[PDB]
């Protein structure tokens, strides 16, 4: 059927992620347990981040949002 | 690595036919809503409310997915 499961963020990257490691990002659904953005690292690695923090918002600016 | 988790953000309305299903898997316990996921013969993933009668019966019946 078509009622797919959705990637949510349950945890949050503690240590701020450096820009040079990241390739892009996409936000999570508004219905997720908590608000979350997902940063794409240049080896496909997806890391959850807490968007209510100064350093993550930085990356949300500087980084292009996931085409997928 | 704080990877995203597959959580069930909505529940399959009507019951699923068992012969269309190969196996089921529970979401992360830290997911907001406590739903299960089914594997079809096709390989599609379907969210289900484990608080229904037709979903638990399908859980007894079918094998638990291999994470």
């Amino acid at each position: 059927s078509w009622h797919r499961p959705d990637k949510c963020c349950l945890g949050y990257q503690k240590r701020p992620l450096p820009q040079v490691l990241l390739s892009s990002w996409y936000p999570t659904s508004q219905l997720c347990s908590k608000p979350g953005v997902i940063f794409l690292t240049k080896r496909g690695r997806q890391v959850c981040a807490d968007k209510s923090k100064d350093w993550v918002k930085k990356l949300m600016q500087q980084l292009p949002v996931t085409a997928r």
Side-chain angles (χ1 to χ4, degrees), chain A residues 3 5 7-67:
Chain A
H3 220 136
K7 318 294 257 11
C8 286
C9 275
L10 300 198
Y12 288 136
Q13 163 60 217
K14 0 85 144 3
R15 359 130 216 124
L17 273 222
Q19 232 268 318
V20 260
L21 287 70
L22 293 353
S23 145
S24 67
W25 77 274
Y26 56 113
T28 64
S29 140
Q30 267 315 161
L31 323 174
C32 272
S33 182
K34 332 189 246 25
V37 336
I38 296 161
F39 291 113
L40 288 223
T41 79
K42 266 155 289 215
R43 245 120 55 120
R45 291 67 197 58
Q46 299 162 342
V47 190
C48 268
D50 185 0
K51 79 218 270 109
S52 107
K53 269 154 210 309
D54 290 339
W55 74 276
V56 54
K57 295 202 271 56
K58 280 358 269 276
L59 304 162
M60 301 194 291
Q61 279 176 122
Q62 305 179 315
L63 280 175
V65 117
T66 303

